[PDB]
Each structure stands twice: as structure tokens, then as C-alpha cells.
Amino acid sequence: KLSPDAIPGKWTSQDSLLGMEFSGRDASGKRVMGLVPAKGLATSVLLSPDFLWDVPSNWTLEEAASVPVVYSTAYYALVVRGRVRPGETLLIHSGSGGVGQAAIAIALSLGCRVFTTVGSAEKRAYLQARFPQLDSTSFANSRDTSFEQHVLWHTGGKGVDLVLNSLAEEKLQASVRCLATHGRFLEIGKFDLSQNHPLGMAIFLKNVTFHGVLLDAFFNESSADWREVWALVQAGIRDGVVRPLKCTVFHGAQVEDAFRYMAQGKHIGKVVVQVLAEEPEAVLKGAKPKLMSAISKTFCPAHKSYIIAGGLGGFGLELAQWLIQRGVQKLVLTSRSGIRTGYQAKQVRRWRRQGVQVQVSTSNISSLEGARGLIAEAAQLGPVGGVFNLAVVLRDGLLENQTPEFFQDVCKPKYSGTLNLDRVTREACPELDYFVVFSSVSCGRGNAGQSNYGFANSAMERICEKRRHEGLPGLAVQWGAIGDVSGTLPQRMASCLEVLDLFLNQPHMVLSSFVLAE
Amino acid sequence: DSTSFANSRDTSFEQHVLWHTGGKGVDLVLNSLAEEKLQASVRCLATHGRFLEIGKFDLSQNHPLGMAIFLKNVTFHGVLLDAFFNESSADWREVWALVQAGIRDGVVRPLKCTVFHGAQVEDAFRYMAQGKHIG
Amino acid sequence: HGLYLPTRVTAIHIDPATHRQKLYTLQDKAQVADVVVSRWLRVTVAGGVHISGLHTESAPRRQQEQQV
Numbered sequence: 001k002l003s004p005d006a007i008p009g010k011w012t013s014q015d016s017l018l019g020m021e022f023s024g025r026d027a028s029g030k031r032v033m034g035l036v037p038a039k040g041l042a043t044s045v046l047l048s049p050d051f052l053w054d055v056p057s058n059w060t061l062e063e064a065a066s067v068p069v070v071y072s073t074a075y076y077a078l079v080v081r082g083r084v085r086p087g088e089t090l091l092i093h094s095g096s097g098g099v100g101q102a103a104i105a106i107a108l109s110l111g112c113r114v115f116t117t118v119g120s121a122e123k124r125a126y127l128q129a130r131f132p133q134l135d136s137t138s139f140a141n142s143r144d145t146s147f148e149q150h151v152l153w154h155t156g157g158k159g160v161d162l163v164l165n166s167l168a169e170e171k172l173q174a175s176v177r178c179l180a181t182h183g184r185f186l187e188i189g190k191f192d193l194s195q196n197h198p199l200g201m202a203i204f205l206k207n208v209t210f211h212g213v214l215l216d217a218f219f220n221e222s223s224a225d226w227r228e229v230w231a232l233v234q235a236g237i238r239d240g241v242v243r244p245l246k247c248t249v250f251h252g253a254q255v256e257d258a259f260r261y262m263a264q265g266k267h268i269g270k271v272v273v274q275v276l277a278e279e280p281e282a283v284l285k286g287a288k289p290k291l292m293s294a295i296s297k298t299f300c301p302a303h304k305s306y307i308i309a310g311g312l313g314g315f316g317l318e319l320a321q322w323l324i325q326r327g328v329q330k331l332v333l334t335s336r337s338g339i340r341t342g343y344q345a346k347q348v349r350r351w352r353r354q355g356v357q358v359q360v361s362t363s364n365i366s367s368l369e370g371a372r373g374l375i376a377e378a379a380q381l382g383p384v385g386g387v388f389n390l391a392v393v394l395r396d397g398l399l400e401n402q403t404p405e406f407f408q409d410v411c412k413p414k415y416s417g418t419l420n421l422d423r424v425t426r427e428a429c430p431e432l433d434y435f436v437v438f439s440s441v442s443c444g445r446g447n448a449g450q451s452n453y454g455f456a457n458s459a460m461e462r463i464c465e466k467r468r469h470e471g472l473p474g475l476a477v478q479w480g481a482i483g484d485v486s487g488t489l490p491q492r493m494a495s496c497l498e499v500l501d502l503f504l505n506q507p508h509m510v511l512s513s514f515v516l517a518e
Numbered sequence: 519d520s521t522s523f524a525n526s527r528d529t530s531f532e533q534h535v536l537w538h539t540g541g542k543g544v545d546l547v548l549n550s551l552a553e554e555k556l557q558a559s560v561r562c563l564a565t566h567g568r569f570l571e572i573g574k575f576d577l578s579q580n581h582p583l584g585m586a587i588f589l590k591n592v593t594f595h596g597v598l599l600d601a602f603f604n605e606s607s608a609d610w611r612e613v614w615a616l617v618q619a620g621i622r623d624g625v626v627r628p629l630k631c632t633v634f635h636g637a638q639v640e641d642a643f644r645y646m647a648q649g650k651h652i653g
Numbered sequence: 654h655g656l657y658l659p660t661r662v663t664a665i666h667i668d669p670a671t672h673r674q675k676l677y678t679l680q681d682k683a684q685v686a687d688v689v690v691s692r693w694l695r696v697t698v699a700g701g702v703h704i705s706g707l708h709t710e711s712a713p714r715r716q717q718e719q720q721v
């Protein structure tokens with residue numbers, strides 16, 4: 001129901017944005033609970049110390065996971081934005097949920113009277129048990145617009161000062177009418193705001209402050225304004241206002257069950273996933289978390305350098321875009337001509353702006369001296385990680401019109417180039433981890449009029465097979481037809497890149513991928 | 519400076535503010551203009567912006583306000599000074615102290631005045647009605 | 654990245670007379686109009702058209718995956 005790009009900040013993953021809060025052991029071993037913009041569900045997280053709190057000894061790490069998000073947003077909405085003061089009357093929707101409970105705990109501490117809305121009766125009972133201060137006159141129904149009448153009646157027709165709204169459509173408009181003069185409306189939902197629904201401006205004749213609250217801005221920006229909310233949360237933690245919520249714990253292996261439990265909508269409290277079990281020691285100073293079986297996918301170090309022979313060419317530019325997304329921050333692209341089109345300049349400028357240390361080269365991998373020069377440039381940038389050979393020089397034609405010169409021309413980039421790259425990499429590349437060369441189904445199946453191209457592709461496979469039997473990395477991917485950049489339909493670049501992601505992990509030497517027509 | 523001025527009767531202050539601010543907008547808008555001008559002014563706000571509304575016409579007419587502006591953190595205020603007289607004296611003392619401090623610090627300077635004698639109060643009303651006065 | 658479709662436009666102005674005035678023929682027989690996009694001002698102007706306040710929202714991929 002939510003598009004990944006809606007989350008503020010540029011992630012490019014299209015996934016892994018799940019999770020916002022966690023509780024675990026700092027690198028040293030202290031018990032901490034943090035607040036990450038995204039990527040909270042994981043066996044580890046990389047977060048700045050400004051977003052980490054210290055778990056008091058009275059708490060267990062299971063409890064810690066419920067405090068950060070709800071209490072940070074509650075404090076930000078009330079104390080920082082609404083400037084709630086003691087004795088005021090405020091309305092909090094969905095009191096059973098975490099945000100509502102944090103708002104109630106903050107409000108009752110100041111001495112404010114509270115009106116709340118709860119969908120079912122058991123939620124009313126639970127809230128009555130949690131906060132004995134509330135009476136039978138402090139409740140209403142969140143599933144209809146009847147709470148307007150309740151709040152207007154019990155407040156003497158005046159209304160309420162603050163209203164923390166999480167509802168939508170007609171229920172938002174109803175909550176607007178409950179405001180009293182000099183009221184403040186704190187909006188934390190995102191449906192009506194996203195849809196640009198209208199709000200009658202006649203409510204502002206009454207001195208009113210309509211607040212748009214989004215805690216996401218703090219995670220990626222506005223660091224200075226964050227320390228205020230951090231201090232408020234810490235003071236609440238020490239002063240007993242911040243009490244951990246109820247926690248329904250699911251194991252790590254049953255995460256889909258946890259998501260289904262959340263989806264059903266029956267939970268009261270905070271759903272927590274137990275990635276790992278807490279130990280009695282107050283400071284474990286452990287080395288690593290326990291290992292688990294997880295799908296394997298490709299990533300690259302930041303200090304490694306990668307090379308794409310024939311990179312400027314269109315299959316090469318999509319492969320590079322894929323690589324930059326997987327962490328490659330220094331690159332080397334080879335091409336005889338150099339940047340000679342608007343598209344290539346656009347892409348390279350964008351990558352340089354992103355921080356990638358791109359460098360276009362003209363060294364020809366055909367000549368062994370050229371291969372040494374290319375590897376030397378990559379070494380100058382950094383230790384060599386991989387070598388992708390995508391160079392190709394087609395000279396098609398039936399065997400009758402083929403000649404030695406055309407065969408030599410086709411073979412120089414692919415066969416000779418791969419040989420020279422292999423030799424130089426063996427000599428002077430210890431840290432190398434990938435070595436890929438691209439072939440065509442014209443090699444396996446065979447095609448008419450491409451005998452030279454087929455021969456050139458086949459020889460590359462042999463070098464890769466030899467490399468793998470010797471223990472060094474190697475791989476040859478035989479493609480069909482690439483779409484965006486035989487009797488087989490063109491394959492889209494998205495599918496091709498996904499498949500290449502799959503192939504780099506398997507143990508086989510030569511692989512293939514093509515789509516059958518009809 | 520000369521880049522701090524724009525045009526009010528026309529709606530050309532949107533391009534000016536956006537251009538000279540780098541497209542970010544502004545942190546605070548004190549608005550006393552009409553419907554189209556008001557809608558143009560809201561679009562000038564930056565993130566975390568604040569829209570102080572001292573007019574009456576749009577509020578009285580109950581004209582609509584697109585809530586998408588609130589997706590960006592924003593604070594929309596309806597500023598009616600008259601509430602201080604009917605109640606909220608404790609709140610009023612804050613404004614009183616602010617104005618007194620401004621007077622005793624030099625921040626508050628007296629505006630220009632066009633004096634009309636008592637017997638010509640009708641002339642004063644007409645002159646203000648013409649709308650050509652400064653001060 | 655991904656595909657974004659229009660969902661709201663604040664204001665659009667069209668004027669065929671100015672449009673006819675703006676179009677300039679290329680060296681070949683084709684007729685061309687020069688466009689500008691100012692993201693700071695949120696205006697897309699070309700010939701006799703003026704799009705202001707365009708807002709686009711990401712659309713989920715159909716995931717037809719017709720290619721397997």
C-alpha cells in the first residue's frame with residue numbers, strides 16, 4: 001500500500017526499508033535502543049550515536065524496543081510542537097496504539113485531562129487498567145464520528161486544546177470541530193495530507209495552530225533540532241514517565257507470522273521480533289552475533305576498485321549503474337573512442353556527483369602492455385576487486401565473405417583481451433574477487449553468419465573454466481538478446497540484471513540466460 | 519537590499535521569492551492579502567515553514583486549503599490579536615513585555631504620521647479610504 | 654527511478670495565438686518548439702503552454718513478469 005520512494009531520502013533499494021527501532025548491544029557491549037530511518041530489521045544496524053539511548057537496568061531489551069519511536073513522536077508532537085501546558089484538555093485518537101499510549105503517559109504526567117478513542121471494548125478495559133486516572137467519561141469510539149458529540153458535551157461545548165489526530169476522511173473533519181479557541185491541531189497521519197484534501201479555513205478565526213508533524217525529517221535532516229527531543233526522552237526515561245508498552249514477541253524465523261499478526265489488526269501494544277536472545281551479562285563484549293541462513297546477494301567493498309572493459313557501451317553502462325548501487329565507489333571504464341554521446345556524459349557526471357570516483361580510460365586490453373596499464377590505473381585508484389570483460393567488435397557475414405582480417409578484428413577484444421586480462425590478474429591482483437566475461441547463445445546454440453563471433457565467445461569460456469579449476473575466480477555468462485540497450489525474444493535489462501545477481505553466487509563456471517519466443 | 523522587494527498587487531512575488539531563495543522558500547510568511555495572493559503565498563513556504571495569517575477575508579469566507587502543504591512539516595497560524603482583550607491577560611503580559619523591551623532597546627521606532635485635526639475627522643476617513651497613505 | 658504518473662497540476666494556461674507565433678520551422682520541413690523546465694519555479698513552458706505545480710506520484714510496477 002506504500003511505495004518505497006515515499007520514505008524520505010534516496011535509498012534506491014526498493015526494499016530493506018522495513019523496521020525503524022531496535023534494541024541491542026553496542027559495539028562495546030552497552031545495552032542501547034536506537035532509531036534508524038530505515039533498515040531496522042537486521043542482525044546489525046549502522047546508526048549515529050545521536051540516535052542511541054541507554055537502556056536503564058530496570059528494563060529488559062524486549063521492553064526497550066517499544067519506547068523509541070512512539071515516545072519520540074509523542075514528545076515531539078506535544079512538548080515541542082503543541083507546547084502542551086499543565087491543566088489543558090486534549091484528545092488523543094487510537095489510545096490503544098503506541099503513539100496514543102505515549103501521548104497519554106506524557107499528558108497524565110503534566111496533569112492534563114484526556115479524552116481517548118478506542119475501537120473495541122477490550123482496548124477500553126486495557127487502557128483503564130494501565131492508567132487508573134482515566135474515568136468512564138474519558139472514552140469514545142474511534143470507528144465513527146460520535147466522539148465529537150461526546151467531547152463537545154463533556155467539555156461544556158468549549159472543546160479541547162490539543163488534538164493528536166491519526167484518523168482520516170470524515171473523522172479528520174470531525175476532529176477539527178472539537179477544537180477550542182487557542183487550540184492546536186497535531187496531525188500525524190498521512191492520508192488526507194497525501195491526497196491534498198481541502199480544509200475549511202474558517203476554523204482559524206478561532207486562534208488555531210494547525211500542525212503538520214512528520215518525525216521522518218529529523219532522521220535525514222534537522223540534526224540540531226533533534227537533540228531537544230532526545231533530551232526530552234532521556235528526562236522521561238529517568239523520571240519514570242516513559243514506561244515500556246506491552247510486547248508480543250515473535251521469533252526471528254517466524255517474521256511473516258508477525259507481519260500477518262500486525263495485519264489482522266487485533267494487537268494491543270507493540271509487536272516485536274526477537275532476532276536474538278538477551279544474556280544475563282550486563283556487558284557481554286561479544287565478538288559477533290550468531291549466524292543465520294539468509295539468501296545470498298552481491299555487494300562490494302568501498303575501498304575496492306572495479307573495471308568494466310567496454311564500459312562506455314550501453315550494456316556496460318547499465319552494469320555499472322547496477323554496480324554503483326551495490327557499493328562500488330571507484331570504477332574504471334575502457335573504450336577506444338572515449339565519451340562521445342550525451343547519454344554517457346550524463347551518466348558519468350551523475351555518478352561523479354554521487355561521489356563515485358569514475359575514470360574513463362583508453363588502454364586497449366588487446367595488447368598485454370595495455371592490460372598492465374589498465375590494471376595499474378585501477379591499482380592507483382585502489383586494490384582491484386573485479387574485471388568485467390564486455391568488449392565486442394562485430395563483423396558479421398556468412399563464411400563465404402569472411403576473411404582472416406575480420407576474424408582477427410573480432411577476436412582481439414574478446415579472446416586476446418580475456419587472455420591478457422587473465423595473465424595480468426594472475427600476476428598482479430591478489431585481492432581480486434570477481435572475474436566475469438559476457439558471451440552469447442550464438443556460442444552454445446550456434447547462429448548463421450556469426451561464425452567469427454561464436455568462435456570468439458567460445459574461447460572465453462575455456463579461459464574461465466581453466467581459472468575456476470585453478471581456484472581463482474571466473475565466470476562466463478551466455479546471454480540471448482538484450483532488450484533496452486536464434487529465435488529468442490529480447491530480454492529486458494531488469495530481468496538480465498536480476499539474473500546476473502543470481503549467477504555471481506552459483507558455483508558453476510559457464511551459465512546462460514535467454515527467453516523463448518512464444 | 520534591492521533584491522528584497524517584489525510586487526504585491528500582482529501574483530509575481532512567487533517567482534521572485536523562489537528564485538532568490540534557491541528554490542527552498544522561506545521560514546515565515548506574514549500574509550494580509552486576498553484569495554489568489556494567499557494561495558500563491560502558501561507555496562512560498564520552505565520545510566518547517568510557518569504561515570502567520572493576519573487577514574480576515576479568506577478565513578471568513580471559509581475558502582479551502584489544500585492539506586498537502588502539511589506533508590512538508592508546516593505550522594499554519596490564525597493570528598487574531600483581539601482575543602487578548604476578551605480573555606488571556608496572562609498571555610497578554612508576554613506581548614506587553616515584548617513591546618516594552620522593544621521600546622527600551624531601540625527596536626521599536628514610531629511610524630510616519632499624517633495629522634488631521636479633530637474637526638476634520640471626516641477628511642481623515644476619506645484620506646485613508648483613498649489608500650494613498652504611507653504610515 | 655521507477656515510473657511516475659501525473660496526479661495533480663496546479664494551473665495550466667494555453668494560448669493558440671502565442672503558440673502559432675512561437676513555433677519556428679527547422680531546416681527540414683518539421684516544425685519545432687523550444688521548451689524550458691525550471692524546477693526552482695515549478696513551471697514547464699513550451700510555445701503557448703504553461704504548466705505550473707505539477708505533482709507526480711510513483712506507481713507500483715505491474716509485476717506482470719511476462720518474461721520468465
Ligand SMILES: NC(=O)C1=CN([C@@H]2O[C@H](COP(=O)(O)OP(=O)(O)OC[C@H]3O[C@@H](n4cnc5c(N)ncnc54)[C@H](OP(=O)(O)O)[C@@H]3O)[C@@H](O)[C@H]2O)C=CC1
Pocket residue numbers: 069070073093094095096097098099100117118119120142143166187188189190213214215216262263264265266269
Ligand atoms: N507523523 C508521523 O510521522 C508519525 C506517525 N505515526 C502515526 O501514529 C499512529 C499510531 O502508530 P503506532 O505507534 O504504530 O500505533 P498502532 O499501530 O499500535 O496503532 C494502530 C491503531 O489503529 C487502529 N487500527 C484499527 N485497525 C487496525 C489495523 N488493522 N492495524 C493497525 N491499527 C489498526 C487501532 O486504534 P482504534 O481501534 O482506536 O481505531 C489501533 O490501536 C499511526 O497512524 C502512525 O502512522 C507514528 C509515529 C510517527
Ligand SMILES: NC(=O)C1=CN([C@@H]2O[C@H](COP(=O)(O)OP(=O)(O)OC[C@H]3O[C@@H](n4cnc5c(N)ncnc54)[C@H](OP(=O)(O)O)[C@@H]3O)[C@@H](O)[C@H]2O)C=CC1
Pocket residue numbers: 309310311312313314315316334335336337338363364365366389390391392393412413438439440441478479480481482485
Ligand atoms: N547486448 C547483447 O545483445 C548481448 C551482448 N553480448 C556480449 O555482452 C556484452 C554486452 O555489450 P554490448 O551490449 O554488446 O555492447 P556494444 O556492442 O554496444 O559495445 C561494446 C563496447 O565495447 C567497447 N569496445 C569494443 N572494442 C573495444 C576494444 N578493442 N577495446 C576497448 N573497448 C572496446 C565499445 O566501445 P568502443 O567501440 O569505443 O571501443 C563499447 O563500449 C558484450 O561483451 C557482448 O559481446 C552477448 C550476448 C548478448
